[PDB]
Amino acid sequence: LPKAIFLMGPTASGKTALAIELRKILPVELISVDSALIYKGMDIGTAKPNAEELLAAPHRLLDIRDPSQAYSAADFRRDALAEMADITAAGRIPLLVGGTMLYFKALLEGLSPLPSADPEVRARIEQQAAEQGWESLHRQLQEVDPVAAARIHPNDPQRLSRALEVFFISGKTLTELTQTSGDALPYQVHQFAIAPASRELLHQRIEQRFHQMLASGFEAEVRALFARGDLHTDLPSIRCVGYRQMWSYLEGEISYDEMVYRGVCATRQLAKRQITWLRGWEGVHWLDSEKPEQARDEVLQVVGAI
RNA sequence: GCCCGGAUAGCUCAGUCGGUAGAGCAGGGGAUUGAAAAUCCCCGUGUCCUUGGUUCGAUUCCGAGUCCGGGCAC
Ligand SMILES: [Mg+2]
Ligand SMILES: [Mg+2]
Ligand SMILES: [Mg+2]
Ligand SMILES: [Mg+2]
Ligand SMILES: [Mg+2]
Ligand SMILES: [Mg+2]
């Protein structure tokens, strides 16, 4: 029953600023919960905290992967669980910060044990999709596992491939393995969510930030990655907002003005989904990004002195 | 100045053999178990620029005006 804090929130919601200000009055250690901040070399498009901020408040799980190696909600959970153990072992409190809700969830509720990704069976699935379409595969999942086929839409290639993969590797069906649940988070958690008061102030912040990034050398950063020659668009790192568009721009597929437009829209569509996650998230305390930055007080009380 | 194209959804455009119109993008909502900043589901009424003419009926055809792209000319 150790204590832990979750500081969730969409992009451009001032999450980071709040976490370090909290580090000031609470014995907390920061753990980054972000599928893109894990990459080395991806610093400005990911809104990664700068060296000075990191100097003040060290973050765990930052720069732990090369953009060529994918991460997962499961690896995060493992690494997070371990990091939390270390932190609480030192008499302090884990403060998990980020906007990757699926990770927060996997950590909180756990994940039913399933086989990890197998490049080989996925290549075979991709090949059969190019030949017969994702339809033949959905019709095949329908035979072996129809609970899943009713949930997964025939147009969702990621989930479809995933449900077949699990079966082709284990022989056991996806709905069957998921009957066994994962280990819940053995902590007492205080969950907070912070966002600007209006959807449109969020949009303004997203737009002005994108421009600050371009002004800070974002293009140069993405080019260094483009020049490596070993990265591609089926990699999570290259599909990150901003990066995917800039990649299209470097490839000569779109113009500069067009890249800026799509990056901003992509960032807004991302924010919109993060809010969809937070809506209905159980036990969440809402805070406000706009000036109520002095929201550390609501935190202060919900968590009470520690 | 003259000629030729455009002008229809917040943007880029289709379309209507004349019976008041629909895609994509933007935007909104919702899913979400090892790629998740991903992947996917659902939501389309707008003076069809204006004005005359023909017509039961015009955004649609024809004239004219206005604005926007080009071209010709100075
Ligand atoms: Mg047209
Ligand atoms: Mg007709
Ligand atoms: Mg309509
Ligand atoms: Mg949309
Ligand atoms: Mg008329
Ligand atoms: Mg007319």
Inter-axis angle of helices A218-226 and A243-250, nearest 10: 70
Q: Return the closest-CA partner of residue A30 out of A79, A75, A96.
A: A96
Which among A133, A122, A234 is positioned nearest to A168, based on CA atoms? A122
Structure-determination technique: X-ray
Kind plus residue range of the DSSP H or E element containing A256: helix A256-278
Q: How many residues does chain A have?
A: 306
Amino acid type, A302: V
Q: Which of A48, A55, A57 is nearest to A18 (CA)?
A: A57
Rounded to the nearest angstrom, the gap between the alpha carbon of residue A61 and the centroid of all alpha carbons in its chain is 12
Measure CA A41 to chain center.
17
Residue A282: CB less than 7 A from any atom in strand B: no
Q: Which uninterrupted H or E stretch holds A286?
A: strand A284-288
CA A73 / C1′ B35 distance in Å: 9
Q: How far is CA A55 from the centre of its chain?
A: 23
State the CB neighbour count (10 A cutoff) for residue A182.
17
| Beta-sheet pairing, A28-33 with A59-60 | parallel
In the structure, how far is the CA atom of residue A251 from the C1' atom of nucleotide B42, in angstroms? Answer: 34
Sequence-distant (6+) residues with CB within 8 A of A252 are none
Alpha helices (H) along A95-156: 101-109, 119-144, 146-151
Using CA atoms, how far apart are residues A88 and A28, in angstroms rounded to an integer?
Answer: 9
Q: Rounded CA gap, A35 and A33, in Å?
A: 7
Say how many Å lie between the CA of residue A131 and the centre of ligand 2.
Answer: 41
Rg (CA), chain A: 21
Distance between CA atoms of A86 and A72, rounded to whole angstroms? 21
CB atoms within 10 A of CB A246: 27
CB of A30 within 8 A of CB of A59? yes
Resolution in A: 2.5
Cβ within 7 Å of strand B: which of A 155-194? 155-159, 161-162, 178, 181-182
Looking across all nucleic acid strands, the nucleotide with the smallest C1' to CA distance from residue A270 is B37
Specify the DSSP element, H or E, that contains A195: strand A188-195
- Helix (H) / strand (E) containing A32: strand A28-33
What tokens were used for A181? 């649940």
Q: For residue A289, give the DSSP letter.
A: S
Measure, in angstroms, how far nucleotide B33 C1' is from residue A112 CA. 7
Question: What domains does chain A contain, in order, with CATH numbers?
Answer: 2-110+183-306 (3.40.50.300), 111-182 (1.10.20.140)
Per the listing, tokens 């997203």 go with: A206
Half-sphere exposure of A143 (CA within 13 A, CB side): 5
Positive or negative CA dihedral for A139, A141, A144, A146?
Answer: negative
Protein residue closest to B11, using CA and C1' = A261
Give the Cα separation of A142 and A56 in Å (integer): 53
* Amino acid, single-letter form, for residue A297: D
Question: Can you tell me which residue has the tokens 């409190």?
Answer: A93
Q: What spacing in Å lies between the alpha carbon of A166 and ligand 4's midpoint?
A: 31
Q: How far is the CA of A235 from the C1' of B38 (A)?
A: 10
Distance CA A151, CA A130 (A): 23
User: Does at least one atom of strand B sit less than 7 Å from the CB of A16?
Assistant: no
Give the integer Cα–Cα distance in Å for A54 and A170. 43
Q: What is the DSSP annotation of A39-100?
A: BTT--TTTTPPPHHHHHHS-EESSS-B-TTS---HHHHHHHHHHHHHHHHHTT-EEEEEES-
Q: Which residue is nearest to nucleotide B28 (CA to C1')?
A: A272
d(CA A104, CA A112): 15
